[PDB]
Amino acid sequence: FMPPREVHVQVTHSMPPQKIEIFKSLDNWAEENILVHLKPVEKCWQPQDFLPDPASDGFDEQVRELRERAKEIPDDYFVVLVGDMITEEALPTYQTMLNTLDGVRDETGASPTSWAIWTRAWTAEENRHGDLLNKYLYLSGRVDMRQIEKTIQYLIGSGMDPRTENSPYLGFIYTSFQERATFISHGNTARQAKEHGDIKLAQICGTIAADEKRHETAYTKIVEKLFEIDPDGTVLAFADMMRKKISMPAHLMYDGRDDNLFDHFSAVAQRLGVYTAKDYADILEFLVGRWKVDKLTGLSAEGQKAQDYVCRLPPRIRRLKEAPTMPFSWIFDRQVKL
Amino acid sequence: FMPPREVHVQVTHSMPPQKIEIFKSLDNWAEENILVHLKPVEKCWQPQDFLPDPASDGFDEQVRELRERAKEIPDDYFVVLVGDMITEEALPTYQTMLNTLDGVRDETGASPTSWAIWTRAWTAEENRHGDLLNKYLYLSGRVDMRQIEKTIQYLIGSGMDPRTENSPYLGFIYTSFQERATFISHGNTARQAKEHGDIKLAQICGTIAADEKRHETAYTKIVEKLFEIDPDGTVLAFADMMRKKISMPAHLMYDGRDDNLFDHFSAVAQRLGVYTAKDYADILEFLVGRWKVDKLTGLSAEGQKAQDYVCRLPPRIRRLKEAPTMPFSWIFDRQVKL
Ligand SMILES: [Fe+3]
Ligand SMILES: [Fe+3]
Ligand SMILES: [Fe+3]
Ligand SMILES: [Fe+3]
């Protein structure tokens, strides 16, 4: 009963130590440009806002009506909603990821650096996503919570190597990509839930989507200023991640039964138009456009090669009855098209 | 609306860098002595095991009977159960804590070192504690989930400085203490729930308690071998933590209303005999006895002073109608004795 493993050797500290100083000296900047784009707790939504109220006489009918709606949502949609939720639930791994980065990590757990304050407030926001989807899926009665819970324990145990090699350059680029990806994934589950006949579930997914957009804004902004100060180092970091290919956080997914769980869940998301191969390149092309890689002047020979590699990759990727039915343990081994 | 803050200046890397090698060289050892005391996922309990089954025709009556039982559990007990749950839910902070430690941290997020494998599998086990207590409290209808969710977001945002200063010595001692403390806290909520007329809730708390015991075993075992190889360095680390005083993980607790939330929740736990000042010293005295500090030979002058300080502290601490009623937002501002 062995979960899938990372296939490559692991590399640490790709960035030079006499280069941590840039982020140390960028602390004030991040206060004024990253930490001012944070919502105070008091003004934040909470999972209870979108769930049946257990301290209300209305609780029983609210639960009953949620379950009635859930019957009319097909299995393959629940498969994707479940994969999205499991990913959200591996959150502890992702805060660990952000705290492996050399010049921008929380060194105590309560560090008063602008980088540490951001990391903690971002985590705290992400925690509500899992909580809300978890209790929604629980109440629904449509899915196998034990096998989901088992998948999650495997996932946190396995963790994940995003190949950011302790570099804020690689790591902040990696977060920029992932934030956009979930914003899209969640955005698309919200759009579909409207017509599927269920406004309350559309609210849940879209409220999560709006959070990811704020996270995206802040991470791409950090890399924006990284290109301003260090065009040579940042363009090389960009290419590096694309050369290696962006590996998704939940790719070591395992439920104790299927050896290709992520690939199988991804294909269902692909077929339903939740997150596609086309999406992947659309993010690449948006990020190449957002950081204006084509207009970067005075680079190295090593930097100009990197520049050309990232600029030409988005059209290259885009140039790339059939699928069978397969059982999923998340839905008691009922089957969906892959 | 400002949460409480850490009152001291933060210190990093108290341990010498030419001393990371000890833990690097201890990797095989931890495999054979720490990682063999880990339960495989397949054999682990999951929160669904102790909760109403939403895919069963019995779901409605199971939920109804849980809520009927919950009416007969008094408010002050729910206050403590809620504080215990919020602490469990700040989990991401605690994995960050373990990954700030110099020679034993996960540097990628999927590192194949024995230290990183342990950290990930421990986190994965801890994640079920929050999930289970969260859904139990939700279904109960006795508590204010929005204000609890708000307290949690404040908590992760604030994080926590355990003052372990990136040292595995200080950090592993700090975990040894905390594991014992929760094992007791959860153990006592389980004992009481029996007579309170509710076996299912007693099962929940005790199953969590059994996990903490396994965690305790492993952490005290690491410090056991630390005293064997480095009596001088470890006794100094022990005292250091006690001199500073063990600060609890959820001590910056804040709900947007009470400025002394942790102190107020602690007092209710104290009055009910869940976790007391007496407990605190009983852990100290167990740990002084467990690591056999009295029998440590050939220490430094600086080491002999440390030895005497830790050995004499447990009796010293033990030598230390009245309380008012106070509202708690966790229970819709209903009041309990403090
Ligand atoms: Fe999210
Ligand atoms: Fe996000
Ligand atoms: Fe726990
Ligand atoms: Fe524990």
PDB file of all heavy atoms in Angstrom, chain A residues 6 8 10 93-94 96-98 100-101 159-166 170-171 174-175 178 240-241 244-249 251, chain B residues 107-110:
ATOM      1  N   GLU A   6       7.954  11.082  -5.487  1.00  0.00           N
ATOM      2  CA  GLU A   6       8.662  11.992  -6.383  1.00  0.00           C
ATOM      3  C   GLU A   6       9.789  11.228  -7.076  1.00  0.00           C
ATOM      4  O   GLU A   6      10.561  10.514  -6.425  1.00  0.00           O
ATOM      5  CB  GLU A   6       9.213  13.201  -5.619  1.00  0.00           C
ATOM      6  CG  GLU A   6       8.155  14.069  -4.939  1.00  0.00           C
ATOM      7  CD  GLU A   6       7.440  15.015  -5.893  1.00  0.00           C
ATOM      8  OE1 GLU A   6       7.573  14.859  -7.129  1.00  0.00           O
ATOM      9  OE2 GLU A   6       6.736  15.924  -5.400  1.00  0.00           O
ATOM     10  N   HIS A   8      12.391  12.321  -8.941  1.00  0.00           N
ATOM     11  CA  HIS A   8      13.694  12.983  -9.077  1.00  0.00           C
ATOM     12  C   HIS A   8      14.427  13.138  -7.742  1.00  0.00           C
ATOM     13  O   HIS A   8      13.829  13.038  -6.669  1.00  0.00           O
ATOM     14  CB  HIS A   8      13.517  14.362  -9.726  1.00  0.00           C
ATOM     15  CG  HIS A   8      12.262  15.057  -9.306  1.00  0.00           C
ATOM     16  ND1 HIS A   8      12.134  15.681  -8.083  1.00  0.00           N
ATOM     17  CD2 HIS A   8      11.065  15.185  -9.923  1.00  0.00           C
ATOM     18  CE1 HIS A   8      10.912  16.174  -7.969  1.00  0.00           C
ATOM     19  NE2 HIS A   8      10.245  15.891  -9.075  1.00  0.00           N
ATOM     20  N   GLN A  10      16.249  15.372  -4.931  1.00  0.00           N
ATOM     21  CA  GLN A  10      15.842  16.667  -4.394  1.00  0.00           C
ATOM     22  C   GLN A  10      17.028  17.617  -4.215  1.00  0.00           C
ATOM     23  O   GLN A  10      18.071  17.239  -3.672  1.00  0.00           O
ATOM     24  CB  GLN A  10      15.071  16.481  -3.088  1.00  0.00           C
ATOM     25  CG  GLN A  10      14.170  15.249  -3.090  1.00  0.00           C
ATOM     26  CD  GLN A  10      12.840  15.473  -2.392  1.00  0.00           C
ATOM     27  OE1 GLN A  10      12.745  16.273  -1.459  1.00  0.00           O
ATOM     28  NE2 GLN A  10      11.814  14.757  -2.836  1.00  0.00           N
ATOM     29  N   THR A  93       1.010  21.440   4.249  1.00  0.00           N
ATOM     30  CA  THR A  93       2.151  21.229   3.348  1.00  0.00           C
ATOM     31  C   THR A  93       2.582  22.518   2.638  1.00  0.00           C
ATOM     32  O   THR A  93       3.779  22.776   2.465  1.00  0.00           O
ATOM     33  CB  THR A  93       1.834  20.132   2.297  1.00  0.00           C
ATOM     34  OG1 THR A  93       1.546  18.892   2.955  1.00  0.00           O
ATOM     35  CG2 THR A  93       3.073  19.814   1.445  1.00  0.00           C
ATOM     36  N   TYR A  94       1.597  23.323   2.235  1.00  0.00           N
ATOM     37  CA  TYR A  94       1.857  24.501   1.410  1.00  0.00           C
ATOM     38  C   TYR A  94       2.458  25.659   2.210  1.00  0.00           C
ATOM     39  O   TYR A  94       3.233  26.444   1.666  1.00  0.00           O
ATOM     40  CB  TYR A  94       0.594  24.939   0.647  1.00  0.00           C
ATOM     41  CG  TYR A  94      -0.221  23.799   0.054  1.00  0.00           C
ATOM     42  CD1 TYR A  94      -1.602  23.931  -0.144  1.00  0.00           C
ATOM     43  CD2 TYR A  94       0.384  22.582  -0.310  1.00  0.00           C
ATOM     44  CE1 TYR A  94      -2.362  22.886  -0.682  1.00  0.00           C
ATOM     45  CE2 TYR A  94      -0.365  21.535  -0.846  1.00  0.00           C
ATOM     46  CZ  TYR A  94      -1.738  21.691  -1.028  1.00  0.00           C
ATOM     47  OH  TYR A  94      -2.475  20.647  -1.564  1.00  0.00           O
ATOM     48  N   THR A  96       4.420  25.048   4.772  1.00  0.00           N
ATOM     49  CA  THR A  96       5.780  24.510   4.885  1.00  0.00           C
ATOM     50  C   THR A  96       6.610  24.892   3.657  1.00  0.00           C
ATOM     51  O   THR A  96       7.739  25.369   3.796  1.00  0.00           O
ATOM     52  CB  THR A  96       5.751  22.970   5.111  1.00  0.00           C
ATOM     53  OG1 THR A  96       5.646  22.704   6.514  1.00  0.00           O
ATOM     54  CG2 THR A  96       7.090  22.298   4.730  1.00  0.00           C
ATOM     55  N   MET A  97       6.028  24.695   2.473  1.00  0.00           N
ATOM     56  CA  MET A  97       6.630  25.115   1.207  1.00  0.00           C
ATOM     57  C   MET A  97       7.074  26.582   1.237  1.00  0.00           C
ATOM     58  O   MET A  97       8.232  26.885   0.924  1.00  0.00           O
ATOM     59  CB  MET A  97       5.667  24.890   0.040  1.00  0.00           C
ATOM     60  CG  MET A  97       6.307  25.021  -1.347  1.00  0.00           C
ATOM     61  SD  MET A  97       6.233  26.686  -2.134  1.00  0.00           S
ATOM     62  CE  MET A  97       4.438  26.802  -2.490  1.00  0.00           C
ATOM     63  N   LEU A  98       6.162  27.480   1.616  1.00  0.00           N
ATOM     64  CA  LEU A  98       6.471  28.913   1.655  1.00  0.00           C
ATOM     65  C   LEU A  98       7.540  29.256   2.694  1.00  0.00           C
ATOM     66  O   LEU A  98       8.275  30.232   2.535  1.00  0.00           O
ATOM     67  CB  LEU A  98       5.208  29.753   1.875  1.00  0.00           C
ATOM     68  CG  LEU A  98       4.308  29.967   0.651  1.00  0.00           C
ATOM     69  CD1 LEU A  98       2.912  30.361   1.093  1.00  0.00           C
ATOM     70  CD2 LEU A  98       4.883  31.014  -0.296  1.00  0.00           C
ATOM     71  N   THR A 100      10.133  27.282   3.414  1.00  0.00           N
ATOM     72  CA  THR A 100      11.432  26.733   3.004  1.00  0.00           C
ATOM     73  C   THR A 100      12.232  27.762   2.196  1.00  0.00           C
ATOM     74  O   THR A 100      13.421  27.563   1.929  1.00  0.00           O
ATOM     75  CB  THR A 100      11.298  25.392   2.197  1.00  0.00           C
ATOM     76  OG1 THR A 100      10.403  25.561   1.091  1.00  0.00           O
ATOM     77  CG2 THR A 100      10.655  24.273   3.032  1.00  0.00           C
ATOM     78  N   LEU A 101      11.580  28.862   1.823  1.00  0.00           N
ATOM     79  CA  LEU A 101      12.208  29.904   1.009  1.00  0.00           C
ATOM     80  C   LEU A 101      13.155  30.797   1.821  1.00  0.00           C
ATOM     81  O   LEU A 101      12.757  31.381   2.835  1.00  0.00           O
ATOM     82  CB  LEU A 101      11.145  30.736   0.280  1.00  0.00           C
ATOM     83  CG  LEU A 101      10.002  29.977  -0.416  1.00  0.00           C
ATOM     84  CD1 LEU A 101       8.972  30.951  -0.970  1.00  0.00           C
ATOM     85  CD2 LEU A 101      10.522  29.043  -1.519  1.00  0.00           C
ATOM     86  N   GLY A 159       3.424  14.551   1.365  1.00  0.00           N
ATOM     87  CA  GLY A 159       3.779  15.923   1.076  1.00  0.00           C
ATOM     88  C   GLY A 159       3.976  16.118  -0.410  1.00  0.00           C
ATOM     89  O   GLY A 159       3.235  15.566  -1.225  1.00  0.00           O
ATOM     90  N   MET A 160       5.012  16.870  -0.759  1.00  0.00           N
ATOM     91  CA  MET A 160       5.160  17.387  -2.110  1.00  0.00           C
ATOM     92  C   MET A 160       6.479  18.164  -2.288  1.00  0.00           C
ATOM     93  O   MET A 160       6.825  19.005  -1.452  1.00  0.00           O
ATOM     94  CB  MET A 160       3.967  18.305  -2.383  1.00  0.00           C
ATOM     95  CG  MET A 160       3.762  18.666  -3.813  1.00  0.00           C
ATOM     96  SD  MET A 160       4.298  20.362  -4.096  1.00  0.00           S
ATOM     97  CE  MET A 160       4.347  20.298  -5.882  1.00  0.00           C
ATOM     98  N   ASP A 161       7.205  17.883  -3.373  1.00  0.00           N
ATOM     99  CA  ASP A 161       8.370  18.693  -3.759  1.00  0.00           C
ATOM    100  C   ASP A 161       8.061  19.544  -5.001  1.00  0.00           C
ATOM    101  O   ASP A 161       8.063  19.033  -6.128  1.00  0.00           O
ATOM    102  CB  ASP A 161       9.622  17.823  -3.986  1.00  0.00           C
ATOM    103  CG  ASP A 161      10.824  18.626  -4.507  1.00  0.00           C
ATOM    104  OD1 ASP A 161      10.894  19.848  -4.244  1.00  0.00           O
ATOM    105  OD2 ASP A 161      11.749  18.115  -5.187  1.00  0.00           O
ATOM    106  N   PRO A 162       7.809  20.840  -4.794  1.00  0.00           N
ATOM    107  CA  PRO A 162       7.494  21.756  -5.897  1.00  0.00           C
ATOM    108  C   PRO A 162       8.740  22.185  -6.668  1.00  0.00           C
ATOM    109  O   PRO A 162       8.621  22.896  -7.672  1.00  0.00           O
ATOM    110  CB  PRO A 162       6.851  22.955  -5.185  1.00  0.00           C
ATOM    111  CG  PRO A 162       7.428  22.945  -3.814  1.00  0.00           C
ATOM    112  CD  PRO A 162       7.812  21.530  -3.488  1.00  0.00           C
ATOM    113  N   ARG A 163       9.912  21.742  -6.207  1.00  0.00           N
ATOM    114  CA  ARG A 163      11.190  21.985  -6.889  1.00  0.00           C
ATOM    115  C   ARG A 163      11.546  23.475  -6.929  1.00  0.00           C
ATOM    116  O   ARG A 163      12.040  23.984  -7.936  1.00  0.00           O
ATOM    117  CB  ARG A 163      11.178  21.386  -8.300  1.00  0.00           C
ATOM    118  CG  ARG A 163      10.712  19.938  -8.368  1.00  0.00           C
ATOM    119  CD  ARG A 163      11.815  18.972  -8.724  1.00  0.00           C
ATOM    120  NE  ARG A 163      11.720  18.510 -10.108  1.00  0.00           N
ATOM    121  CZ  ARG A 163      12.765  18.292 -10.903  1.00  0.00           C
ATOM    122  NH1 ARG A 163      14.002  18.495 -10.461  1.00  0.00           N
ATOM    123  NH2 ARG A 163      12.577  17.871 -12.148  1.00  0.00           N
ATOM    124  N   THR A 164      11.292  24.156  -5.817  1.00  0.00           N
ATOM    125  CA  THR A 164      11.535  25.590  -5.687  1.00  0.00           C
ATOM    126  C   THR A 164      12.910  25.841  -5.078  1.00  0.00           C
ATOM    127  O   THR A 164      13.375  26.988  -5.007  1.00  0.00           O
ATOM    128  CB  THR A 164      10.449  26.239  -4.815  1.00  0.00           C
ATOM    129  OG1 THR A 164      10.246  25.443  -3.638  1.00  0.00           O
ATOM    130  CG2 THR A 164       9.100  26.191  -5.523  1.00  0.00           C
ATOM    131  N   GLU A 165      13.530  24.754  -4.615  1.00  0.00           N
ATOM    132  CA  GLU A 165      14.934  24.731  -4.197  1.00  0.00           C
ATOM    133  C   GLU A 165      15.308  25.885  -3.250  1.00  0.00           C
ATOM    134  O   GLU A 165      16.382  26.493  -3.371  1.00  0.00           O
ATOM    135  CB  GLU A 165      15.853  24.674  -5.434  1.00  0.00           C
ATOM    136  CG  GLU A 165      15.674  23.420  -6.286  1.00  0.00           C
ATOM    137  CD  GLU A 165      16.227  23.553  -7.702  1.00  0.00           C
ATOM    138  OE1 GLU A 165      17.328  24.124  -7.881  1.00  0.00           O
ATOM    139  OE2 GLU A 165      15.562  23.066  -8.644  1.00  0.00           O
ATOM    140  N   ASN A 166      14.397  26.169  -2.317  1.00  0.00           N
ATOM    141  CA  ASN A 166      14.555  27.196  -1.278  1.00  0.00           C
ATOM    142  C   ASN A 166      14.688  28.630  -1.792  1.00  0.00           C
ATOM    143  O   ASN A 166      15.000  29.548  -1.025  1.00  0.00           O
ATOM    144  CB  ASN A 166      15.699  26.846  -0.319  1.00  0.00           C
ATOM    145  CG  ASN A 166      15.581  25.441   0.234  1.00  0.00           C
ATOM    146  OD1 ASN A 166      16.289  24.537  -0.200  1.00  0.00           O
ATOM    147  ND2 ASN A 166      14.675  25.247   1.189  1.00  0.00           N
ATOM    148  N   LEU A 170      11.981  31.109  -7.473  1.00  0.00           N
ATOM    149  CA  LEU A 170      11.293  29.920  -7.974  1.00  0.00           C
ATOM    150  C   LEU A 170       9.982  29.699  -7.234  1.00  0.00           C
ATOM    151  O   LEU A 170       8.977  29.332  -7.839  1.00  0.00           O
ATOM    152  CB  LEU A 170      12.184  28.670  -7.842  1.00  0.00           C
ATOM    153  CG  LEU A 170      13.534  28.548  -8.581  1.00  0.00           C
ATOM    154  CD1 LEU A 170      14.270  27.272  -8.176  1.00  0.00           C
ATOM    155  CD2 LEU A 170      13.369  28.576 -10.087  1.00  0.00           C
ATOM    156  N   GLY A 171      10.003  29.927  -5.923  1.00  0.00           N
ATOM    157  CA  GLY A 171       8.847  29.705  -5.067  1.00  0.00           C
ATOM    158  C   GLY A 171       7.693  30.666  -5.289  1.00  0.00           C
ATOM    159  O   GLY A 171       6.531  30.239  -5.331  1.00  0.00           O
ATOM    160  N   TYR A 174       6.173  29.922  -8.556  1.00  0.00           N
ATOM    161  CA  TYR A 174       5.383  28.704  -8.411  1.00  0.00           C
ATOM    162  C   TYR A 174       4.023  28.987  -7.761  1.00  0.00           C
ATOM    163  O   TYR A 174       3.022  28.393  -8.153  1.00  0.00           O
ATOM    164  CB  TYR A 174       6.164  27.623  -7.641  1.00  0.00           C
ATOM    165  CG  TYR A 174       5.353  26.372  -7.347  1.00  0.00           C
ATOM    166  CD1 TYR A 174       5.403  25.262  -8.193  1.00  0.00           C
ATOM    167  CD2 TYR A 174       4.524  26.305  -6.219  1.00  0.00           C
ATOM    168  CE1 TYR A 174       4.641  24.119  -7.925  1.00  0.00           C
ATOM    169  CE2 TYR A 174       3.761  25.173  -5.946  1.00  0.00           C
ATOM    170  CZ  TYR A 174       3.825  24.087  -6.797  1.00  0.00           C
ATOM    171  OH  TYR A 174       3.066  22.968  -6.512  1.00  0.00           O
ATOM    172  N   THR A 175       3.985  29.887  -6.778  1.00  0.00           N
ATOM    173  CA  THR A 175       2.718  30.285  -6.147  1.00  0.00           C
ATOM    174  C   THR A 175       1.839  31.114  -7.087  1.00  0.00           C
ATOM    175  O   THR A 175       0.630  30.901  -7.146  1.00  0.00           O
ATOM    176  CB  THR A 175       2.940  31.047  -4.819  1.00  0.00           C
ATOM    177  OG1 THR A 175       4.044  31.967  -4.956  1.00  0.00           O
ATOM    178  CG2 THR A 175       3.374  30.097  -3.725  1.00  0.00           C
ATOM    179  N   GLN A 178       0.038  28.647  -9.348  1.00  0.00           N
ATOM    180  CA  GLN A 178      -0.929  27.813  -8.639  1.00  0.00           C
ATOM    181  C   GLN A 178      -2.192  28.572  -8.240  1.00  0.00           C
ATOM    182  O   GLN A 178      -3.300  28.042  -8.363  1.00  0.00           O
ATOM    183  CB  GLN A 178      -0.287  27.162  -7.414  1.00  0.00           C
ATOM    184  CG  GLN A 178       0.673  26.013  -7.720  1.00  0.00           C
ATOM    185  CD  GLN A 178       0.067  24.905  -8.583  1.00  0.00           C
ATOM    186  OE1 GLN A 178      -1.135  24.632  -8.519  1.00  0.00           O
ATOM    187  NE2 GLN A 178       0.907  24.259  -9.386  1.00  0.00           N
ATOM    188  N   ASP A 240      13.506  28.060 -15.581  1.00  0.00           N
ATOM    189  CA  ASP A 240      13.876  26.906 -14.761  1.00  0.00           C
ATOM    190  C   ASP A 240      12.655  26.094 -14.352  1.00  0.00           C
ATOM    191  O   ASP A 240      12.651  24.868 -14.476  1.00  0.00           O
ATOM    192  CB  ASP A 240      14.656  27.360 -13.520  1.00  0.00           C
ATOM    193  CG  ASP A 240      15.178  26.186 -12.693  1.00  0.00           C
ATOM    194  OD1 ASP A 240      16.205  25.581 -13.075  1.00  0.00           O
ATOM    195  OD2 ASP A 240      14.627  25.793 -11.640  1.00  0.00           O
ATOM    196  N   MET A 241      11.620  26.792 -13.882  1.00  0.00           N
ATOM    197  CA  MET A 241      10.384  26.161 -13.432  1.00  0.00           C
ATOM    198  C   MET A 241       9.605  25.538 -14.591  1.00  0.00           C
ATOM    199  O   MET A 241       8.956  24.503 -14.425  1.00  0.00           O
ATOM    200  CB  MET A 241       9.498  27.173 -12.700  1.00  0.00           C
ATOM    201  CG  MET A 241      10.068  27.714 -11.396  1.00  0.00           C
ATOM    202  SD  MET A 241      10.316  26.468 -10.100  1.00  0.00           S
ATOM    203  CE  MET A 241       8.648  25.821  -9.871  1.00  0.00           C
ATOM    204  N   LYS A 244      11.392  22.390 -15.950  1.00  0.00           N
ATOM    205  CA  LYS A 244      11.080  21.280 -15.055  1.00  0.00           C
ATOM    206  C   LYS A 244       9.596  20.903 -15.121  1.00  0.00           C
ATOM    207  O   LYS A 244       9.235  19.763 -14.824  1.00  0.00           O
ATOM    208  CB  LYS A 244      11.491  21.609 -13.612  1.00  0.00           C
ATOM    209  CG  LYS A 244      12.992  21.880 -13.426  1.00  0.00           C
ATOM    210  CD  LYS A 244      13.393  22.027 -11.957  1.00  0.00           C
ATOM    211  CE  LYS A 244      12.772  23.262 -11.305  1.00  0.00           C
ATOM    212  NZ  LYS A 244      13.600  23.789 -10.188  1.00  0.00           N
ATOM    213  N   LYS A 245       8.759  21.862 -15.528  1.00  0.00           N
ATOM    214  CA  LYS A 245       7.296  21.723 -15.592  1.00  0.00           C
ATOM    215  C   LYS A 245       6.646  21.854 -14.215  1.00  0.00           C
ATOM    216  O   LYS A 245       7.064  21.206 -13.248  1.00  0.00           O
ATOM    217  CB  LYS A 245       6.847  20.427 -16.295  1.00  0.00           C
ATOM    218  CG  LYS A 245       7.282  20.316 -17.761  1.00  0.00           C
ATOM    219  CD  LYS A 245       6.941  18.951 -18.359  1.00  0.00           C
ATOM    220  CE  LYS A 245       8.099  17.959 -18.232  1.00  0.00           C
ATOM    221  NZ  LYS A 245       9.087  18.059 -19.354  1.00  0.00           N
ATOM    222  N   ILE A 246       5.622  22.704 -14.146  1.00  0.00           N
ATOM    223  CA  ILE A 246       4.913  23.004 -12.906  1.00  0.00           C
ATOM    224  C   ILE A 246       4.149  21.780 -12.409  1.00  0.00           C
ATOM    225  O   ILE A 246       3.124  21.404 -12.987  1.00  0.00           O
ATOM    226  CB  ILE A 246       3.942  24.208 -13.121  1.00  0.00           C
ATOM    227  CG1 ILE A 246       4.710  25.488 -13.492  1.00  0.00           C
ATOM    228  CG2 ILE A 246       3.031  24.414 -11.908  1.00  0.00           C
ATOM    229  CD1 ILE A 246       5.492  26.128 -12.353  1.00  0.00           C
ATOM    230  N   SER A 247       4.655  21.152 -11.350  1.00  0.00           N
ATOM    231  CA  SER A 247       3.973  19.998 -10.759  1.00  0.00           C
ATOM    232  C   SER A 247       2.935  20.450  -9.731  1.00  0.00           C
ATOM    233  O   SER A 247       3.245  21.224  -8.825  1.00  0.00           O
ATOM    234  CB  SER A 247       4.966  18.974 -10.168  1.00  0.00           C
ATOM    235  OG  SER A 247       5.983  19.583  -9.390  1.00  0.00           O
ATOM    236  N   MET A 248       1.700  19.981  -9.901  1.00  0.00           N
ATOM    237  CA  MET A 248       0.570  20.378  -9.050  1.00  0.00           C
ATOM    238  C   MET A 248       0.682  19.827  -7.621  1.00  0.00           C
ATOM    239  O   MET A 248       1.222  18.737  -7.422  1.00  0.00           O
ATOM    240  CB  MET A 248      -0.759  19.964  -9.698  1.00  0.00           C
ATOM    241  CG  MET A 248      -0.938  20.445 -11.154  1.00  0.00           C
ATOM    242  SD  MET A 248      -0.922  22.261 -11.340  1.00  0.00           S
ATOM    243  CE  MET A 248      -2.578  22.665 -10.747  1.00  0.00           C
ATOM    244  N   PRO A 249       0.174  20.579  -6.633  1.00  0.00           N
ATOM    245  CA  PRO A 249       0.352  20.239  -5.211  1.00  0.00           C
ATOM    246  C   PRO A 249      -0.189  18.855  -4.811  1.00  0.00           C
ATOM    247  O   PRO A 249       0.379  18.209  -3.924  1.00  0.00           O
ATOM    248  CB  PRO A 249      -0.445  21.332  -4.486  1.00  0.00           C
ATOM    249  CG  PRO A 249      -0.544  22.457  -5.455  1.00  0.00           C
ATOM    250  CD  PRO A 249      -0.611  21.816  -6.803  1.00  0.00           C
ATOM    251  N   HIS A 251      -0.419  16.069  -6.626  1.00  0.00           N
ATOM    252  CA  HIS A 251      -0.072  15.076  -7.638  1.00  0.00           C
ATOM    253  C   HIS A 251       0.329  13.702  -7.099  1.00  0.00           C
ATOM    254  O   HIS A 251       0.272  12.710  -7.830  1.00  0.00           O
ATOM    255  CB  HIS A 251       0.913  15.632  -8.690  1.00  0.00           C
ATOM    256  CG  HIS A 251       2.352  15.615  -8.273  1.00  0.00           C
ATOM    257  ND1 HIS A 251       2.867  16.476  -7.327  1.00  0.00           N
ATOM    258  CD2 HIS A 251       3.396  14.867  -8.705  1.00  0.00           C
ATOM    259  CE1 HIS A 251       4.161  16.245  -7.180  1.00  0.00           C
ATOM    260  NE2 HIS A 251       4.506  15.273  -8.006  1.00  0.00           N
TER     261      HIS A 251
ATOM    262  N   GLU B 107      13.317  20.369   4.013  1.00  0.00           N
ATOM    263  CA  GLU B 107      13.841  21.487   3.225  1.00  0.00           C
ATOM    264  C   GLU B 107      13.140  21.691   1.877  1.00  0.00           C
ATOM    265  O   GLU B 107      13.324  22.734   1.228  1.00  0.00           O
ATOM    266  CB  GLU B 107      15.356  21.342   3.029  1.00  0.00           C
ATOM    267  CG  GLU B 107      16.160  21.631   4.290  1.00  0.00           C
ATOM    268  CD  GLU B 107      17.565  22.098   3.994  1.00  0.00           C
ATOM    269  OE1 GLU B 107      18.378  21.270   3.528  1.00  0.00           O
ATOM    270  OE2 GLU B 107      17.862  23.289   4.232  1.00  0.00           O
ATOM    271  N   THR B 108      12.341  20.700   1.470  1.00  0.00           N
ATOM    272  CA  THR B 108      11.616  20.754   0.199  1.00  0.00           C
ATOM    273  C   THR B 108      10.108  20.719   0.410  1.00  0.00           C
ATOM    274  O   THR B 108       9.361  21.427  -0.269  1.00  0.00           O
ATOM    275  CB  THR B 108      12.026  19.578  -0.718  1.00  0.00           C
ATOM    276  OG1 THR B 108      11.871  18.341  -0.010  1.00  0.00           O
ATOM    277  CG2 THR B 108      13.521  19.616  -1.045  1.00  0.00           C
ATOM    278  N   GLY B 109       9.671  19.893   1.357  1.00  0.00           N
ATOM    279  CA  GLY B 109       8.264  19.563   1.510  1.00  0.00           C
ATOM    280  C   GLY B 109       7.981  18.101   1.199  1.00  0.00           C
ATOM    281  O   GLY B 109       6.884  17.613   1.460  1.00  0.00           O
ATOM    282  N   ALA B 110       8.965  17.406   0.628  1.00  0.00           N
ATOM    283  CA  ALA B 110       8.873  15.967   0.389  1.00  0.00           C
ATOM    284  C   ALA B 110      10.204  15.272   0.663  1.00  0.00           C
ATOM    285  O   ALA B 110      10.461  14.183   0.135  1.00  0.00           O
ATOM    286  CB  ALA B 110       8.414  15.690  -1.033  1.00  0.00           C
TER     287      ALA B 110
END
